[PDB]
Design an enzyme around this catalytic site. Structure first.
Site, PDB file in Angstrom:
ATOM      1  CD  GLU A  12      -2.934  -1.182   2.546  1.00 47.55           C
ATOM      2  OE1 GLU A  12      -2.273  -0.949   3.427  1.00 47.55           O
ATOM      3  OE2 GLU A  12      -4.056  -1.404   2.387  1.00 47.55           O
ATOM      4  N   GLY A  78     -12.501  -3.360   1.884  1.00 46.55           N
ATOM      5  CA  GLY A  78     -13.516  -4.142   1.521  1.00 46.55           C
ATOM      6  C   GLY A  78     -14.863  -3.427   1.157  1.00 46.55           C
ATOM      7  CD  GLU A 174      -5.046  -1.026   8.768  1.00 43.84           C
ATOM      8  OE1 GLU A 174      -5.244  -0.573   7.648  1.00 43.84           O
ATOM      9  OE2 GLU A 174      -4.583  -2.305   9.035  1.00 43.84           O
ATOM     10  CG  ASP A 197     -11.944  -7.539   0.060  1.00 39.25           C
ATOM     11  OD1 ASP A 197     -12.675  -7.580   0.553  1.00 39.25           O
ATOM     12  OD2 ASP A 197     -10.813  -6.781   0.118  1.00 39.25           O
TER      13      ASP A 197
HETATM   14  N1  LIG Z   1     -12.525  -7.619   3.851  1.00 42.98           N
HETATM   15  C1  LIG Z   1     -11.574  -6.530   4.317  1.00 42.98           C
HETATM   16  N2  LIG Z   1     -11.854  -6.511   5.936  1.00 42.98           N
HETATM   17  C2  LIG Z   1     -11.135  -5.750   6.499  1.00 42.98           C
HETATM   18  N3  LIG Z   1     -10.097  -4.938   6.171  1.00 42.98           N
HETATM   19  C3  LIG Z   1      -9.973  -5.134   4.626  1.00 42.98           C
HETATM   20  C4  LIG Z   1      -9.005  -4.345   3.870  1.00 42.98           C
HETATM   21  C5  LIG Z   1      -8.055  -3.292   4.224  1.00 42.98           C
HETATM   22  N4  LIG Z   1      -6.829  -3.707   4.800  1.00 42.98           N
HETATM   23  C6  LIG Z   1      -5.962  -4.941   4.152  1.00 42.98           C
HETATM   24  C7  LIG Z   1      -5.348  -5.758   5.329  1.00 42.98           C
HETATM   25  C8  LIG Z   1      -6.033  -7.138   5.059  1.00 42.98           C
HETATM   26  S1  LIG Z   1      -5.199  -8.108   6.453  1.00 42.98           S
HETATM   27  C9  LIG Z   1      -3.702  -8.566   5.272  1.00 42.98           C
HETATM   28  C10 LIG Z   1      -2.977  -9.914   5.794  1.00 42.98           C
HETATM   29  C11 LIG Z   1      -2.020 -10.244   4.752  1.00 42.98           C
HETATM   30  N5  LIG Z   1      -2.525 -10.740   3.635  1.00 42.98           N
HETATM   31  C12 LIG Z   1      -1.025 -11.086   5.621  1.00 42.98           C
HETATM   32  O1  LIG Z   1      -1.115 -12.342   5.570  1.00 42.98           O
HETATM   33  O2  LIG Z   1      -0.396 -10.799   6.346  1.00 42.98           O
HETATM   34  C13 LIG Z   1      -5.564  -4.877   6.701  1.00 42.98           C
HETATM   35  O3  LIG Z   1      -4.567  -3.648   6.840  1.00 42.98           O
HETATM   36  C14 LIG Z   1      -6.895  -4.097   6.269  1.00 42.98           C
HETATM   37  C15 LIG Z   1      -9.086  -4.733   2.410  1.00 42.98           C
HETATM   38  N6  LIG Z   1     -10.251  -5.510   2.521  1.00 42.98           N
HETATM   39  C16 LIG Z   1     -10.567  -5.816   3.931  1.00 42.98           C
END
Ligand SMILES: Nc1ncnc2c(CN3C[C@H](CSCC[C@H](N)C(=O)O)[C@@H](O)C3)c[nH]c12
Ligand SMILES: Nc1ncnc2c(CN3C[C@H](CSCC[C@H](N)C(=O)O)[C@@H](O)C3)c[nH]c12
Lengths: 230, 230
Positions: A12, A78, A174, A197
């Site tokens: 990001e 999201g 956040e 998403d």
């Molecule tokens: N569906 C969703 N629910 C909550 N947050 C988000 C987001 C926003 N950010 C994206 C991010 C998702 S947690 C990422 C974990 C990463 N793939 C890992 O494995 O470390 C977190 O900073 C919140 C996008 N889609 C979301």
């Protein structure tokens, strides 16, 4: 003018980091701050890490050390509004916690003691953001963004949010924490994210595939906004 | 040597504040910091406000301004362990978020990306706090303490915690956020709290009635521990 920008993930902040001229890096409290000029304007860009506490810590450091005039929170989200597609922009007019519950003492759901029920984003920042979206000819939604320490992936997690915050247009992890810190320091705040998403049963797969597109579009917006604010 | 002490509410810090010699007050970011000597030991006492973000903001400010050698988190808590009664003492051996969920990406329940699944409290601080318990003849349990942005009030909120964290001895709203910030700054941390309620359907009424008892007992503990540490 000095613009503060905060994002959670490497993916990001990396595009914006690369556009910073005369960049210097500081590391403290597990956060990286990159300072320099973005197209002539002084910026300070923080990579906070993920979730409420990582964001609040990052925001407090940025305020205390770099003293920016405004803060913009960037990255993915999201999508909850039905008109949103992957890559589209969401702008906060308000932020609330979707997971805060002190209703035993008669507080509104999502409200913490000593806080407003929701944190309103800065009107001038919203106006400037809207003008960027129009100039760039992007599809966007303005509204309530909700945050919690959960990745939303359909089923009960999503249902609960739709029930409790039917006007929420997007969810993330956040924004509201950064809004809370900014409220306490009385610094203007706005969220400018893009959709990775739609927080449903497919959201983990959509997020992996579309994080890059969400980063690209949010970066486009943020640099256009920085230019407009100056 | 300088001991940092963090409490959320006026009621949890007022007794300790009254005992500080050469008391100087700093207000910033919605938080009050009181500095001076507590029975000849240099202390910095922060009143943070309630919940994870307020506590993180508060902890970050204390660490930056006052550079304490250690942090003690004090106040009330909801007892989960069967032997706790109102006024009894809980000492953290570890803290975890009970409300964090990124399991969709393979993390343990309660773990945030980039974090350990739990934050271990400092062994030397734990041992000092156990000697205080003994000196004051108190009933206490040492264990997992869990935190979230909710006041636990029986029903499904409690069942969920008891199921996800059957070894948790107590629940509150700030400790793990402080442990997280201390983790990121490599500062020793311990929670020393007193039971105000048992997190059941009556916890809101028990809290109102027994907050003053919990504050008095945690204060007794904190005053003793500060002396032991210096
Ligand atoms: N569906 C969703 N629910 C909550 N947050 C988000 C987001 C926003 N950010 C994206 C991010 C998702 S947690 C990422 C974990 C990463 N793939 C890992 O494995 O470390 C977190 O900073 C919140 C996008 N889609 C979301
Ligand atoms: N049952 C419980 N659940 C979660 N936390 C606690 C605690 C510890 N803290 C006590 C405090 C409860 S929220 C106070 C609300 C306040 N009376 C008000 O009306 O503004 C918050 O800082 C968490 C004691 N019992 C708990």
């Amino acid at each position: 003018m000095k613009i503060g920008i905060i994002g959670a993930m490497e993916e990001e902040v990396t595009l914006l980091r690369d556009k910073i001229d005369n960049r210097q890096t500081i590391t403290l409290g597990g956060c990286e701050i990159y300072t320099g000029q973005l197209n002539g304007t002084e910026v300070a860009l923080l990579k906070s890490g993920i979730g409420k506490v990582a964001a609040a810590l990052g925001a407090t450091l940025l305020l205390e050390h770099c003293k920016p005039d405004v803060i913009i929170n960037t990255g993915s989200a999201g999508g909850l509004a039905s008109t949103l597609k992957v890559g589209d922009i969401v702008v906060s007019d308000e932020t609330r916690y979707h997971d805060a519950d002190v209703t035993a003492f008669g507080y509104e759901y999502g409200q913490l003691p000593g806080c407003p029920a929701g944190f309103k984003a800065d009107d001038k920042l919203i106006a400037a953001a809207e003008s960027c979206i129009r100039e760039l000819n992007l599809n966007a939604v303005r509204g309530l963004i909700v945050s919690g320490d959960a990745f939303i992936n359909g089923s009960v997690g999503l249902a609960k949010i739709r029930h409790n915050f039917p006007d929420a247009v997007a969810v993330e992890m956040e924004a509201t924490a950064i809004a809370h810190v900014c409220h306490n320091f009385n610094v203007p705040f706005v969220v400018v994210r893009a959709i990775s998403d739609v927080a449903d049963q497919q959201s983990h797969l959509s997020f992996d595939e579309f994080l890059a597109v969400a980063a690209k579009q949010s970066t486009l917006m943020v640099e256009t906004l920085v230019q407009k604010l100056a």
